[PDB]
Amino acid sequence: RSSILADLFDSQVVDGTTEDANGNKVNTKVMLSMQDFGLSLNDAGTLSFD
Amino acid sequence: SNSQTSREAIAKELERIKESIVQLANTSVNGQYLFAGSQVANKPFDSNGN
Amino acid sequence: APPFTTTSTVQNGPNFSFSANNSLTIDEPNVDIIKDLDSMIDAVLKGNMR
Amino acid sequence: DLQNTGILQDLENYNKAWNDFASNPNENATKIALVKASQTLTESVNNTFA
């Protein structure tokens, strides 16, 4: 379970000297993930999807 | 996704992580704050890492 | 003192430093859980990945 | 030692109270019960003398 907890939402990063999402102004790094590709987390160390 | 509200939001997990860790650190099993050094019988910590 | 060459001219350094415009380290054996946690919150709030 | 004589048993359970004292010194009764077992011990040495 700890091993899977490492991989659960693998991702890729996006970059640019540009406007990071203005929605309440994130700042860190731009990404798309398995938290975004239809799939998501729920609190039990469990997955959720659409 | 980490909008400043999200960045605060995601932080607010950490306080609960912080709170829980403080709770379990100060845990007074059989009266002993189980981890006040070896002197587990009296306050080991505060919330602020003191 | 000058002059110098592209070949590094070297001369032995100090015994001590006491306060400094320190370089930025992220690697150490040691740990300070709580001070780390609050510091990382500082990174998160303004969004320090860099 | 029909009923292994009180002194040797006073010592025994007294030493049982010791491992109990190790269980919780903050539980003062561990002291008191421990103390009492010796009290029988010592006073039993006293009466045998007489």
Curated annotation (Swiss-Prot), chain A:
Q: State start and end of the fragment within the whole protein.
A: 347 to 396 of 642
Task: Please describe the quaternary structure of this protein.
Answer: Homopentamer.
Name the gene that codes for it: fliD
Name the family the entry cites. Belongs to the FliD family.
Subcellular location per UniProt equals: Secreted; Bacterial flagellum
Note the SS bond partners. Answer: none
The entry's function note states: Required for the morphogenesis and for the elongation of the flagellar filament by facilitating polymerization of the flagellin monomers at the tip of growing filament. Forms a capping structure, which prevents flagellin subunits (transported through the central channel of the flagellum) from leaking out without polymerization at the distal end.
Q: Which organism is it from?
A: Campylobacter jejuni subsp. jejuni serotype O:2 (strain ATCC 700819 / NCTC 11168)
Source organism, top-level taxon: Bacteria
Q: What is this protein called?
A: Flagellar hook-associated protein 2
